[PDB]
Subunit: 620 residues, 2 copies
């Protein structure tokens, strides 16, 4: 289950396959399999990584439904492949892919936001190799994220009772209809690379955990002793693995040799004296170096980690034993040109903006992000709530075992990929599913989600808190949200209801806060906000003005400040982002406190000033 990011070292090399590929669109339900046997005819250029949808203005690829086919050639020296295990990794292909090498089907993947790989040792040959990747963008009632099989996209307008409308629907061009509020960007959204490991025996997975901290400093910068655990998995076939712990300056501060036992695994614990802890706003990273022993080294892998604990205790959220307060937002992987394509310039800039704002956290709304963003947040001291793509869900999905299977894959896959990041403090198993109502519906939702809550706990060796992000609903008939480790609520009082009336919005919010006060869980906002067009101004700000967005946060935040059990404020959204078109989306979702080009609206300045005065620890 290990999916360690490809590394280059004395025992391993990575050969990136990013660049400008060849590309063709294909059919709604098929593509020509023979395209894997020869160069694509009349190809278009297509940069990888990137969504394909915004990379060709002659076409309207945002309207594309079904398959596209990518292809490129590559060659590597015979010297490099000799005796090695050769692996082809796709960091993400959104949503499903069939992969061919030299005309041989390697296999397929379903799930648009997690990495997958193939052993191509036997399919590779000398000279030029032809790599063909068919990618399917289709979403529907059995996918995560969820699409609608008929009707409209989420938040779409209709006149369904007009006979002409009903008839035209029957014959309209097939389109994906997201049951979620972000554009269905598709393609090779993240990197592609060929990499090598030793063949006879190799490191397959590494898990590092913080088991216990002894005598944590008052400022939490250090602990007198930290007990960490390692678990290393091997593939291949009295062997041993050397584990070296490097501090921030690369000094080997601890080292052990562990026996490998057969399924082939080595595990143990290491005590670190005067351990330097990882904290929001004050990152510190160690490296665990694993070396498979025969002076020689057979294989090696360098795994970054941070030493810190996470504990929900009553209505507090303790990081290294200190009461943490979330400041931040949901984000999206979204930008002009790239779409959902990973862009590390943008990631570096965004992390700097999180600091400029004096925020300390975000959520990976609504899918796991590119691996590089978590590495960045590890080094920059920004906390993450890591979320699977289970958005758009309701009772139709809970009754479908295929969806449950995909959901379990997404949870296991996210945690297997991301478990070693100190920046991740909580897992989210869904966003805005249907949880409330009458009859059997609330119990049916609980019966669907409770085993997934348990799965996220079982899968994470650090046993971090697990939540489910709840959409505005009848909280009195929802019986699932209140059972989560942290209550995470999306609320739009004064925007989607009581519209523009901030007094009424705050009154309604306080009524629901009184409800949560009794439940006795820690609670935080994971969404709240107001669409805002930069440059629209009013002396008495109305909806869509910069002033209304600022006033909205000023009023709502004054209310949650009065509740000691309310442990965080993550707003919606960090930045404006693309959506399916519709009458409430002014060139996408405009609830960003920043524009899509990362420029600050009035509310961003107001929030920066507020957040400057709120400490990471001890606010409540």
């Amino acid at each position: 289950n290990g999916m360690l990011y490809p590394q280059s070292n004395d025992s391993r090399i990575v050969f990136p396959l990013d660049g400008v590929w060849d590309f063709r669109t294909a059919g709604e339900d098929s593509y020509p399999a023979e395209w894997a046997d020869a160069p694509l005819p009349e190809p278009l250029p297509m940069a990888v990584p990137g969504s394909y949808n915004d990379q060709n203005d002659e076409l309207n690829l945002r309207a594309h439904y079904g398959w596209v086919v990518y292809q490129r050639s590559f060659a590597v020296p015979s010297r490099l492949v000799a005796g090695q295990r050769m692996i082809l990794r796709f960091d993400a292909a959104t949503h499903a892919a069939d992969v061919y090498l030299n005309g041989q089907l390697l296999g397929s993947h379903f799930g648009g936001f997690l990495p997958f790989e193939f052993d191509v040792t036997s399919a590779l040959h000398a000279g030029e190799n032809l790599l063909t990747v068919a990618v399917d963008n289709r979403i529907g009632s059995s996918t995560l994220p969820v699409g609608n099989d008929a009707g409209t996209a989420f938040m779409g307008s209709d006149n369904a009772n007009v006979p002409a409308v009903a008839e035209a629907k029957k014959h309209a061009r097939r389109q994906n209809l997201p049951n979620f509020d972000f554009f269905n960007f598709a393609g090779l959204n993240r990197h592609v690379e060929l990499y090598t490991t030793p063949a006879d025996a190799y490191i397959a997975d590494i898990a590092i955990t913080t088991e216990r901290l002894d005598h944590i400093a008052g400022d939490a910068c250090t602990a007198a002793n930290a007990l960490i655990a390692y678990d290393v998995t091997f593939g291949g076939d009295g062997r041993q693995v050397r584990i070296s712990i490097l501090d921030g300056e690369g000094t080997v501060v601890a080292g052990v040799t562990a026996d490998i036992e057969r399924t082939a695994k080595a595990s143990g614990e290491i005590a670190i004296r005067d351990a330097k802890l990882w904290n929001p706003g004050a990152a510190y990273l160690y490296t665990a170096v694993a070396e498979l022993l025969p002076s020689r080294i057979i294989d090696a892998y360098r795994q970054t980690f941070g030493i810190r604990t996470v504990e929900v205790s009553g209505t507090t959220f303790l990081i290294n034993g200190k009461p943490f307060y979330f400041k931040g937002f949901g984000k999206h992987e979204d930008s002009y040109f790239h779409g959902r394509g990973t862009d590390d310039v943008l990631n570096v800039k965004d992390v700097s903006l999180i600091h400029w704002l004096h925020a300390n956290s975000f959520r990976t709304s609504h899918y796991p992000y590119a691996e590089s963003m978590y590495d960045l947040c590890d080094r920059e001291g920004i906390v993450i709530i890591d979320e699977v793509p289970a958005v758009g869900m309701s009772w139709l999905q809970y009754a479908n075992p295929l969806v449950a299977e995909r959901h379990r894959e997404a949870i296991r896959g996210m945690i297997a990929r991301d478990k070693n990041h100190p920046c991740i403090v909580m897992w989210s198993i869904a966003n805005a599913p249907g949880l409330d109502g009458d009859g059997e519906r609330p119990r049916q939702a609980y019966d669907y989600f409770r085993p997934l809550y348990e799965l996220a706990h079982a899968s994470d060796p650090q046993n971090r808190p697990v939540t489910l992000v709840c959409c505005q609903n009848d909280y009195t008939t929802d019986i699932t949200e209140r059972t989560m480790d942290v209550v995470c609520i999306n609320r739009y009082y004064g925007w989607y209801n009581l519209s523009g009336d901030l007094d009424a919005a705050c009154h309604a919010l306080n009524i629901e806060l009184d409800f949560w006060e009794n439940i006795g869980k820690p609670v935080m906002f994971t969404e709240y906000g107001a669409d805002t067009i930069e440059g629209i101004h009013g002396t008495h700000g109305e909806m869509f003005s910069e002033e209304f967005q600022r006033d909205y946060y000023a009023r709502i935040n004054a209310e949650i400040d009065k509740r000691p059990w309310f442990i965080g404020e993550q707003l919606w959204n960090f930045a404006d982002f693309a959506t399916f078109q519709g009458i409430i989306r002014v060139e996408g979702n405009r609830k960003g406190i920043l524009t899509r080009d990362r420029q600050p609206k009035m509310a961003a300045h107001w929030l920066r000033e507020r957040w400057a005065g709120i400490p990471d620890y001890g606010y409540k």
Copy 2:
């Protein structure tokens, strides 16, 4: 002098070093050299490739003056470096760099827009290697592009006679003051990679030229015969040259003797050759294979060089591609985007080429510096013509007497042409943008004496011997004696914008007076800039300056005038898209003369131009 882009094949591998590096700002005139000896203290993250300026909103890196230091570590298997020649290539470090590996100074480079490399065979070691790169952003009276040592940035406002202003200037924080109208984005703007070649003997350079075409078809798609030439240089006997067509079929091949300094050269006849044309690209591959003594079947080294078969000839007032009279449709561009700055972005390059097609344009100029190599490969495959330009922008008489500037200028011309010579999409070289050329006394002759040797140098350096131009600023064309001697006259004119403002009747009258002057000169003439700053969303029934309507009306009126001149062979407007500049009173969040917004969205004028260009053929318009 060869700088072939790194390739992976059976004898060569490339190891990319892009990613998130460590980064620190340093001083105005220095940086700590000891930072090369250990990991940078308290580093910031910085993505490579990219400009650094817009990658950290906590800092104000747009205001930074002087040095920054990049650093990262890397490791590669010993088995792959063993016995190989190891080269570290920087596609671009803007503007100057000192490079260290494991604490050893490899060397330095000046020139922010062309690649450079170091042999690191001896400096590499097993395990982790520490690569430290100091990058200097400073510009001034001896750099290309040119900065101002004092005063204001180009087209900056001043009240120089106010004593308080004069005094405050003396004590103001040092800042780069561009003498050019684009922001001074700096850093590791393009890719970094380590690559290998065989050590004993290897291919160092390849030049492919189209020497002659016989009996070109009426539609220019083919010629009965094409004579091409190859010139292969080696470092560190025979080389096999194979010519592969679009399907990879070997249609021609010769084995050539290597003579010492070590080179092989010759000619190859291609019967029924498929030609490269604007709007109808066709590419061959020349595969060069170094053969062992002497001799066996095995290959010592190989390189695959893309090329296209086409001729370029200025004839009277026509610009002939494959003997057909071409008409340029397009624009100056910039490598410019949110977040990336001047950083190369192939998603953006792929998108921009699709927009060039959407507009029905056929060409652009690399204003005002050589672009990333990948964009030329893309234009080769997409049939888009390029005017390739060096960063000699902001120049005036202060520079012409400066030997360091002249050397840097010669370096840029030789470096650009050495890097870019094999692209069929490149049809013309530009040796400068908007230098001072006119005036009285000795000034016009001084400018001519500076630029004429550079014109000759561009001709001597290009084995294809393509036309050479100098892109001319709006000036007194009657006292300029340099522009009229270029192979194609390329003019930047802003009648109705920077002069006769808003009066399109007067602008067209003035343009026609200057066109009458060029009609007498008897050379082919094209626009390389003309336009109007335009804020998307500003509208008027009678469009005034900055409205979308005025921009549309501007092109409608000016283009109607040049359509009347048979010797006017192209229209490249300013600009493809809005881009960042130094701040000032005439730049509304940068330069807004884009027909597209900075996010590549079309203004009214873009739609009008799309319809116009749809009706103008690549060949035979005039």
